[PDB]
Amino acid sequence: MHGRLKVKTSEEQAEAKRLEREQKLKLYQSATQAVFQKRQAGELDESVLELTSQILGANPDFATLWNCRREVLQHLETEKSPEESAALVKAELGFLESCLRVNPKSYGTWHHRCWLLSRLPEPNWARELELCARFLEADERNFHCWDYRRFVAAQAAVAPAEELAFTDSLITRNFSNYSSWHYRSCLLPQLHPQPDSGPQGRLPENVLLKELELVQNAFFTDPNDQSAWFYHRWLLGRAEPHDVLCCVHVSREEACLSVCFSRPLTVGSRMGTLLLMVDEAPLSVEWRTPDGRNRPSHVWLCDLPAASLNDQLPQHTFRVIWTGSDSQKECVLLKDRPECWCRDSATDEQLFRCELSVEKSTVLQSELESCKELQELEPENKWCLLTIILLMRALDPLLYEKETLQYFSTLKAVDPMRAAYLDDLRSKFLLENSVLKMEYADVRVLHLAHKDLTVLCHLEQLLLVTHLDLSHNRLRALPPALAALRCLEVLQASDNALENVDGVANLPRLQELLLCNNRLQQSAAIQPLVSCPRLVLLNLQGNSLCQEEGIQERLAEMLPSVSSILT
Amino acid sequence: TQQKDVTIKSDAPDTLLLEKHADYIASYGSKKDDYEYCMSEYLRMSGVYWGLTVMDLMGQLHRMNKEEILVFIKSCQHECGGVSASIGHDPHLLYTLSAVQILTLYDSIHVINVDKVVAYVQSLQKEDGSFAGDIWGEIDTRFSFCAVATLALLGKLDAINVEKAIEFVLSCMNFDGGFGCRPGSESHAGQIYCCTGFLAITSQLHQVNSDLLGWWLCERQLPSGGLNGRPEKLPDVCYSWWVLASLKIIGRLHWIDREKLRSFILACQDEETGGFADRPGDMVDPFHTLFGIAGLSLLGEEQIKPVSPVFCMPEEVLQRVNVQPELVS
Numbered sequence: 001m002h003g004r005l006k007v008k009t010s011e012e013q014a015e016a017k018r019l020e021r022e023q024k025l026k027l028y029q030s031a032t033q034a035v036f037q038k039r040q041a042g043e044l045d046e047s048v049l050e051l052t053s054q055i056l057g058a059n060p061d062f063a064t065l066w067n068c069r070r071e072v073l074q075h076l077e078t079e080k081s082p083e084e085s086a087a088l089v090k091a092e093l094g095f096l097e098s099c100l101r102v103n104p105k106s107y108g109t110w111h112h113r114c115w116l117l118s119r120l121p122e123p124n125w126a127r128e129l130e131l132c133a134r135f136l137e138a139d140e141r142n143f144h145c146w147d148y149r150r151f152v153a154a155q156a157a158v159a160p161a162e163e164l165a166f167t168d169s170l171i172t173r174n175f176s177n178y179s180s181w182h183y184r185s186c187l188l189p190q191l192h193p194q195p196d197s198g199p200q201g202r203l204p205e206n207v208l209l210k211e212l213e214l215v216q217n218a219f220f221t222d223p224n225d226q227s228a229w230f231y232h233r234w235l236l237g238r239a240e241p242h243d244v245l246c247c248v249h250v251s252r253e254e255a256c257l258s259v260c261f262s263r264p265l266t267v268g269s270r271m272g273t274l275l276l277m278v279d280e281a282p283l284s285v286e287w288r289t290p291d292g293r294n295r296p297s298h299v300w301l302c303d304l305p306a307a308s309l310n311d312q313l314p315q316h317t318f319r320v321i322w323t324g325s326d327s328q329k330e331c332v333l334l335k336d337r338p339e340c341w342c343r344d345s346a347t348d349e350q351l352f353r354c355e356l357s358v359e360k361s362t363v364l365q366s367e368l369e370s371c372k373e374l375q376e377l378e379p380e381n382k383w384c385l386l387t388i389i390l391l392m393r394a395l396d397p398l399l400y401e402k403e404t405l406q407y408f409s410t411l412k413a414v415d416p417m418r419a420a421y422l423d424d425l426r427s428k429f430l431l432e433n434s435v436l437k438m439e440y441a442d443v444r445v446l447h448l449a450h451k452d453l454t455v456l457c458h459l460e461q462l463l464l465v466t467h468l469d470l471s472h473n474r475l476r477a478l479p480p481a482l483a484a485l486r487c488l489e490v491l492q493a494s495d496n497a498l499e500n501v502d503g504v505a506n507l508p509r510l511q512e513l514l515l516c517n518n519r520l521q522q523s524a525a526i527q528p529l530v531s532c533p534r535l536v537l538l539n540l541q542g543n544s545l546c547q548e549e550g551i552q553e554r555l556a557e558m559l560p561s562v563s564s565i566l567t
Numbered sequence: 568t569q570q571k572d573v574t575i576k577s578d579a580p581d582t583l584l585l586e587k588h589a590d591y592i593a594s595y596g597s598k599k600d601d602y603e604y605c606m607s608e609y610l611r612m613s614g615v616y617w618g619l620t621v622m623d624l625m626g627q628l629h630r631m632n633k634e635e636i637l638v639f640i641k642s643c644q645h646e647c648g649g650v651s652a653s654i655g656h657d658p659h660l661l662y663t664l665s666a667v668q669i670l671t672l673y674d675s676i677h678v679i680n681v682d683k684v685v686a687y688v689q690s691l692q693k694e695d696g697s698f699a700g701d702i703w704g705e706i707d708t709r710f711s712f713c714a715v716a717t718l719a720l721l722g723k724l725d726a727i728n729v730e731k732a733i734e735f736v737l738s739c740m741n742f743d744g745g746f747g748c749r750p751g752s753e754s755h756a757g758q759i760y761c762c763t764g765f766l767a768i769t770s771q772l773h774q775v776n777s778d779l780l781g782w783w784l785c786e787r788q789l790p791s792g793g794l795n796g797r798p799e800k801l802p803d804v805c806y807s808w809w810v811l812a813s814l815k816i817i818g819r820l821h822w823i824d825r826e827k828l829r830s831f832i833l834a835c836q837d838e839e840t841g842g843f844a845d846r847p848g849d850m851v852d853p854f855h856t857l858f859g860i861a862g863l864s865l866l867g868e869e870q871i872k873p874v875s876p877v878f879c880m881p882e883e884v885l886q887r888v889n890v891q892p893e894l895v896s
């Protein structure tokens with residue numbers, strides 16, 4: 001299976017068959033047979049141990065033989081003196097470690113060793129912690145011994161700051177190692193962190209500064225090492241609220257309240273539903289997804305009765321409570337307003353960029369100054385170049401937007417196998433910038449023309465957008481997540497590579513759909529627009545579905561309600 | 568090759584050698600009367616699943632001996648309902664799922680007692696939602712997967728506590744977006760396959776951070792074009808399958824260089840003999856032959872039948888039984 005060089009066993013080794021050591025396989029099979037016969041006869045004695053130790057000593061993954069040793073050993077505990085059983089156990093431990101040397105990643109062998117140790121009144125844990133240290137110096141990437149360490153630590157109690165203790169004493173003349181950063185990524189959050197609400201970092205700023213500087217000395221001392229960089233990416237990024245309804249919106253005309261959550265959720269499932277309080281008095285409503293299917297969704301809505309919007313008071317007030325977390329969205333809809341809402345900015349409500357204190361800005365910005373310097377030593381180091389990008393982002397998306405773009409182009413030339421990931425990641429960040437540009441200017445128009453977008457992201461943050469320019473990019477589909485765009489009236493998506501337009505379905509206010517110069521092949525890809533209640537201007541010019549029939553009449557029957565269909 | 572970091576591709580096989588692979592598997596059990604055939608008897612039921620599945624992906628299932636396989640399988644069910652790798656060995660969920668996958672291929676499920684299989688699967692579920700591999704207790708998310716896969720193919724996903732099951736798998740999600748075998752274990756490709764497969768079967772893919780996990784998975788591509796199973800390991804055809812399947816499942820298959828990975832996998836073929844090995848120039852076996860074939864199929868190779876990234880079985884087999892989990896997009 002692994003690592004077996006194809007050398008001398010091929011039809012060209014001028015040593016034909018001679019495929020023996022079946023002397024070993026006969027021995028093997030007889031021994032096997034003989035164990036199986038003992039066991040059904042109920043002979044649970046040291047004879048089974050001897051014969052299985054022969055077979056497991058050469059193949060420690062014959063799991064059924066571990067079951068057999070367990071049945072014997074269990075049996076013997078109630079027949080052997082305490083000191084006879086203590087020698088059997090010692091002998092078992094050494095026999096296990098020998099079997100681990102045959103295969104250091106044998107699942108049945110390790111579990112056999114957990115079974116035995118968890119049933120000792122008083123184990124020697126130093127024996128066990130030393131075996132881990134041994135199998136890790138022979139292979140530092142053996143994660144089985146890191147799990148076995150967590151087993152020792154939980155069995156012996158070992159409290160969680162003493163275990164981080166351990167990892168510290170490993171940041172120095174130790175090494176790198178996905179397995180120790182992984183462990184701290186579990187230990188810290190257990191040991192310190194208190195996600196209170198407002199400010200949104202991964203680690204108590206207090207520890208997140210220093211755990212940055214930590215992994216700094218690690219990626220500076222060996223840039224060409226990756227665990228440090230991977231762990232550092234996590235450190236930069238966001239804790240997730242969850243206690244986030246992030247938008248609520250009402251339209252008088254649609255008589256509909258729409259909500260967008262931070263993550264796709266099912267309303268009315270295990271731990272949450274939405275309650276509605278309208279004029280500070282309760283309203284029983286049926287929540288749904290735009291498509292009426294009720295799958296997990298960022299965007300949910302409900303119908304409102306005329307009494308929630310009528311002119312019986314000059315105002316209505318609509319408080320939405322999601323009961324999973326107990327986070328709250330009230331919007332207030334005034335006498336003659338067509339709409340009202342309450343939304344989370346990208347800007348203030350830390351939608352995707354961590355807000356920085358002076359102290360934090362100074363360390364990230366100093367590690368800005370550092371990754372460049374390094375870049376001049378190691379210009380093809382792809383990890384440094386991504387982390388420069390990621391470091392601009394935490395830091396100030398807006399201003400280093402030009403640099404960001406040049407860094408992406410360099411990293412793409414340096415790491416061409418991820419070119420598709422990097423375009424998608426650059427698209428995401430440009431759409432984030434645009435949301436800041438839209439919100440900064442307080443409008444509802446999003447302009448993402450000529451940005452070389454290859455994918456759309458964050459669409460649930462666009463619930464109030466009324467005009468979207470996506471023209472001149474490299475999009476291949478308008479995805480179903482576009483269903484969050486509940487106010488969208490005008491979508492300019494001409495001059496892209498679109499071949500699928502399914503997420504335009506169920507858009508309630510979309511009047512104008514410009515799809516000029518795209519890759520809509522067979523009409524038919526137009527079928528979903530049937531569900532667009534307001535569409536009035538469909539421009540399909542420049543697609544090859546236009547050379548179809550007399551096309552301007554199939555589409556009329558497909559889309560009888562669409563007043564102007566340009567092919 | 569082999570370096571710490573990767574392999575070098577030595578101008579060798581750049582063509583798909585389908586006839587050779589099919590002769591390899593067909594005559595695999597007939598090479599002799601010794602070898603690892605004896606010493607791999609502890610996984611036999613899985614080895615039969617690998618050889619059947621690859622043969623069928625390749626349109627050549629009829630070259631294999633259905634009847635005897637059917638006799639073999641029935642003889643490995645134990646009275647508790649779980650099946651063993653082979654005759655006289657102990658039942659285990661691993662070999663339970665293999666047996667069920669083979670009988671799905673042959674539309675011959677009721678060769679074995681199906682309510683029994685169910686109750687075997689139900690008995691392994693723990694309080695917290697996890698699944699042990701067998702009565703001796705090892706907990707692994709790979710068995711969460713095997714449990715929900717096995718029941719999906721039987722139409723009885725309802726028989727276990729699906730909510731708690733889901734909750735245990737999600738409690739094994741790590742800081743890199745991947746999953747380990749139990750809470751706090753490290754991410755690696757086999758483990759991410761089991762979990763994303765699980766979350767696919769149970770309709771929970773919206774819980775996965777596709778962008779973060781998909782990034783981690785696309786970073787498994789080495790300059791040779793092979794994938795490894797985690798940072799700093801050599802490329803391998805089996806980790807490459809696990810990573811590719813996980814990427815398709817989470818909607819991120821375009822994040823990999825498809826042509827380089829194609830090349831790498833093609834380089835793992837043994838021109839003489841047929842079969843694929845873990846890496847170029849190594850010894851071939853059926854497990855790597857299945858994943859070399861399934862990966863190529865997932866990369867677009869039209870000669871090969873389309874394979875599911877959840878089940879590792881011909882998609883037309885699963886369509887037929889109506890079992891097609893919805894993937895991300």
Ligand SMILES: [Zn+2]
Nearest residue numbers: 803805806845
């Ligand atoms: Zn492999």
